[PDB]
Design a binder for this molecule. Sequence first.
Ligand SMILES: CC(C)C[C@H](N)C(=O)NS(=O)(=O)OC[C@H]1OC[C@@H](CCCn2cc(CCc3ccccc3)nn2)[C@H](O)[C@@H]1O
Ligand SMILES: [Mg+2]
Ligand SMILES: [Zn+2]
Length: 813
Amino acid sequence: MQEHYQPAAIEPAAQKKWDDARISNVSEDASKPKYYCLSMFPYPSGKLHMGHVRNYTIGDVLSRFKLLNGFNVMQPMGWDAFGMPAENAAMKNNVAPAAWTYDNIEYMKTQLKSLGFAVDWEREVATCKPEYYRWEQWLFTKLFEKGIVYRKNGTVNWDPVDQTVLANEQVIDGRGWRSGALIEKREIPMYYFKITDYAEELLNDLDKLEHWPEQVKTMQRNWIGKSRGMTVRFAVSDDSKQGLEGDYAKFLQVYTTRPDTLMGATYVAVAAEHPLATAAAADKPELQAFIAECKAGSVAEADMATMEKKGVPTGRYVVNPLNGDKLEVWIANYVLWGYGDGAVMAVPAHDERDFEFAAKYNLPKKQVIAVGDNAFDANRWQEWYGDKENGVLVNSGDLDGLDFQTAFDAVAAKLQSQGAGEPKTQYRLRDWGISRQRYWGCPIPIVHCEKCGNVPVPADQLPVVLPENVVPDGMGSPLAKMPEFYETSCPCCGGAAKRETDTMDTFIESSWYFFRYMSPKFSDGMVSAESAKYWGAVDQYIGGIEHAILHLLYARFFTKLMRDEGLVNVDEPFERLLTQGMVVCETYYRENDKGGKDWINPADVELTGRPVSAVLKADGLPVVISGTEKMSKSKNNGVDPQELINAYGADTARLFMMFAAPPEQSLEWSDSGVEGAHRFLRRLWRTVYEYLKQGGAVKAFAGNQDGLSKELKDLRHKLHSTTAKVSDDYGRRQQFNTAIAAVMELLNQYDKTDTGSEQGRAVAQEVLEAAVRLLWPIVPHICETLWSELNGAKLWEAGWPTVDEAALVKSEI
Ligand SMILES: CC(C)C[C@H](N)C(=O)NS(=O)(=O)OC[C@H]1OC[C@@H](CCCn2cc(CCc3ccccc3)nn2)[C@H](O)[C@@H]1O
Ligand SMILES: [Mg+2]
Ligand SMILES: [Zn+2]
């Protein structure tokens, strides 16, 4: 055994040992209990970043822990390969997105292998290969026939200078983020998943997920946004009917979740597209301009609530069916056409947004709810104004004294008897629009025939292969400019026809890849029945919190679709969910000759104990140390994990990632922290080396410890206490930094114990054999090497250390 720890001399050898034993290559073995541990698969962007290393180390800790506990562990990896990155790289580098992708995959795969993750590489998938995406085309065609996928006109943001469609997030002040050109709102036919048909199931099945973080479930519930409310129809006043047709001349229909406050409505608000707005705006230029501004807005969903709320009066009036009040209709920018009726009532005394709206425009506020003896102030909002649990109705005529639910029902009865309203359930959830006007993505398996319509491609003809010999040019989506692709024959009639040229939202590939890993070479279906039956659902999912809403909702939706197709028989894809925090680093800059800042990468900086400033490492010239934030290309503060691996080895990288912070917490890059991790591995190495240098290995202590000295009993107590703590940290708390600290304390106590005697050496052997197995999930290369110097058995067959209960009983006084 070499005296000094040298990662480059041990890490390739350990990886070859595991590869040869095929310990991570698993089959559907009915004799061993399955465990499916899955980390969110990466975009093959070029090289790993530190967020990747943290995610896949967490996954590997849990996977190796379960492996040592006797599970048949599947830990698969693959590549979320479609999307805009490869297209931008294509336009920047004049290479094919496919060529760029496959080169990146090969490089990043080598990186992952060098980190020693216990991955079943025989299950690798790449979502840009036709062997993968043919199956989501297949599912598309099956749901299209059932109407679960459908085609309808929708509105997109068109950038006329970049000649491409933009999401709301890429529209700034009504202009394209890169071009700076004014966006055009365009109506185009697009394809949608009817996810609203599954809203109730997606909402209610969240309650099954006892091992999901409560915040993720809360975010999903709020996104789905089910409400139990009331439809209410306000008769249009006789003087307000000019320009109105049909039922819009008879009544203004609204949806409210607070019909118990209907006696307190003081005005109503309609969307810019509402017929009442159209009729009112006919002779009023200010209304026309307000409507145009609303239609030209491109507010992203995450920003909708922060938008400043604005409105204009219409001079039109409706009548409250409960009390007979004549209320003025306003057009407001927060009322969205397509949500319910595109019209709401406003109760400023008991809804905070209505309070601020009415306070701005000096609209009336009428208290109809009282909470105890609390004072109502029409000039200042108080939280109890919105209370639904402990209020009773006041100023509400024959409804006074009722609580929320009782008043809800009485209003429902009153309105229904009059024909002026009825209870109604609504959902914020929109249908999922999947058409993308992009090249590097899964082709939509539809053929347009002037005789037959929009026709799904037959299953025998799938996949519709995306041609890979394409270099996007930036003057429009390439597929629409390639007749060699889109000119085809109709599969129903054989007539001249055109393939659909839009591609699929790349969320589609990540909505089912966890099932494909179960049988990634299965050519007769999305996933084979035998594999789906064996692996079931993902036992443990690990990924960033930024995916808590869309990706997880989409995956749960696809799981229920595939269940309803007979492909799987789980209701939920992921049993346990661990969401990791971001990785952050200090930033560095020098000021510009243009009064700005240029951001320097930390690897090109050297600091100069009490630290005082830093300078550029190539050419000494002091830079400004700046604030710490998420690693990004924006502030050029990304630390290349490859340089960390090159300088210290994979185990140091993994140990620092797991020790620096709990997974949910932000992990701050620290040079001293990395050095501390490496120093700890050197200490572990030296501890075993020095132990073996003073006598070589012995049989580890086991059994009755009567007659052991007090000092050795105390060390065995610490040993088996540490095993219990680490087991609980890996298995239950999923806090790995405290597990590492626990082993450090065991080694601290070992260091203070005289283990020179015969019984001392046996206990020392027991301590070291446990310590290297307790740390193997985190730093497997060094623990594999040290284990083999201590013991001739296969470490993974020795298994997870057991707690000796007898070592935890204390002497009787
Ligand atoms: C299931 C699919 C939908 C997943 C999808 N293909 C995807 O997210 N793929 S992925 O490849 O993006 O990420 C793969 C995983 O691992 C990294 C995590 C980052 C956490 C935040 N995060 C980022 C950073 C730093 C990033 C950075 C660093 C240095 C330079 C430049 C950038 N720190 N924390 C991700 O949430 C995810 O679990
Ligand atoms: Mg349960
Ligand atoms: Zn046809």
